[PDB]
Amino acid sequence: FPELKNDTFLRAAWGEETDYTPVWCMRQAGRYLPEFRETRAAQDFFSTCRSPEACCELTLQPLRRFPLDAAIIFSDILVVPQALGMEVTMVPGKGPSFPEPLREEQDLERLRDPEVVASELGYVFQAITLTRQRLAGRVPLIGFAGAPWTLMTFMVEGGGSSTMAQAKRWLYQRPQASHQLLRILTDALVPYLVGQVVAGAQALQLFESHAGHLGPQLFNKFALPYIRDVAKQVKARLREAGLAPVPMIIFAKDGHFALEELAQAGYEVVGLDWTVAPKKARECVGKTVTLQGNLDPCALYASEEEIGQLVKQMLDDFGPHRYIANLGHGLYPDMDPEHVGAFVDAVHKHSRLLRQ
């Protein structure tokens, strides 16, 4: 691959000092961009995900508008449950659905052996290689997947939920079958994430987007062990294959209660939602992980001047060390690309002023 030119994001992820704070945005390839909507109108969602050229194009679009310090491959976390043998749709304007969710223990029999999942996800690896080549070393490329618990919630609920009552009912009433499913997911995720790195990914983020539905006791029993396993096994396999391990980011949205445990879970970077005060997060995680985040995505509805001031305040709280800027979740479809631009420029501007 082409030599990396701007490695600020990677240096920051490993905790090294940098000249400015690197920034990227979750869902930077997203519907808030008119050009994203146009490229997407061509195919259906999961068909877009299966076209390396389409994925590459969507990945590059934000970088043409903004000097973001990382790209993230266009894909979706739900490709893993799909590759395990579940059928999944993107309903017109009503999000992901599994018309036949997992509801009893016997339903696990329908899933593929987790060891064959990576072979089913070749299309993602093709997209990663192509995007890495086309990026031509501009900035690092992040690969990603959903965390076991979060993927379990989609598989059991059949979509989004305000309570995760069915998935949590599994945890309390079917603890053994839950662990079995969480292990299947872990065993699928590890080779998939390794394959993403083999294909060209230079960092990995694991999205535990539905952490907040668990309190600490269930999180520690059912989510944390598998989060830890994913990091340990991915690093081991990469070492063994003669490759360099990449920085790994754990993002547990609404996971305020788990920050101390997440800082010990074998990830270089702990991603934060907007509800956690940066200084409180720093006390929780300690001095040797990098934090990522955490501006309220809705702050981007404010004026460009206001966004600059909110960014300044955020960066004052995080300080110059061991920090990668981002929002506290993904960009929303109704947001203004110019305000995303203002966010990026302000992180760059204020982080330089904070140093010198």
Ligand X SMILES: Cc1c2[nH]c(c1CCC(=O)O)Cc1[nH]c(c(CCC(=O)O)c1C)Cc1[nH]c(c(CCC(=O)O)c1C)Cc1[nH]c(c(C)c1CCC(=O)O)C2
Take residue 26 and report the two structure tokens written for it.
């979750």
By CB under 8 A, tell whether 280 contacts its own copies.
Answer: no
323-327 and 71-72: which strand pairing? unpaired
74 binds ligand X (CB under 6 A): yes
Q: Is 238 in the site for ligand X (CB under 6 A)?
A: no
Q: List, as one string, the DSSP characters of 179-242.
A: HHHHHHHHHHHHHHHHHHHHTT-SEEEEEETTGGGS-HHHIIIIIHHHHHHHHHHHHHHHHHTT
CB of 41 or CB of 287, closer to its own copies? 41
- Please choose, out of 127-135, 315-323, 327-335, 337-345, the segment that lies near its own copies by the rule CB under 8 A: 127-135
One character per residue 184-213, x = contact with ligand X (rule: CB under 6 A): -----------------------x-x----
The residue range among 83-91, 161-169, 267-275, 306-314 that interacts with its own copies, by the rule CB under 8 A, is 83-91
Q: Could you give the CA distance from residue 35 to residue 51 in angstroms, rounded to a whole number?
A: 17
Residue 348 found at the interface with its own copies (CB under 8 A):
no
* Distance in Å from the first CA to the final CA of the chain: 35
> Which residues 6+ apart lie within 8 Å of 344 measured at CB?
23, 25, 66, 67, 68
Per-residue x/- marks for ligand X, 310-339, CB under 6 A? --------------------x--x------
Smaller CB distance to ligand X: residue 6 or 161?
161
CB within 8 Å of 320: residues ≥ 6 apart = 17, 21, 351, 354, 355
Residues 116-175 that bind ligand X (CB under 6 A): 144, 159-160
Site for its own copies in 293-332 (CB under 8 A): none
H/E stretch holding 93 reads none
Which stretches of the chain bind its own copies, using CB under 8 A? 2, 5, 60, 64, 85-87, 99-100, 106-107, 109-110, 133-138
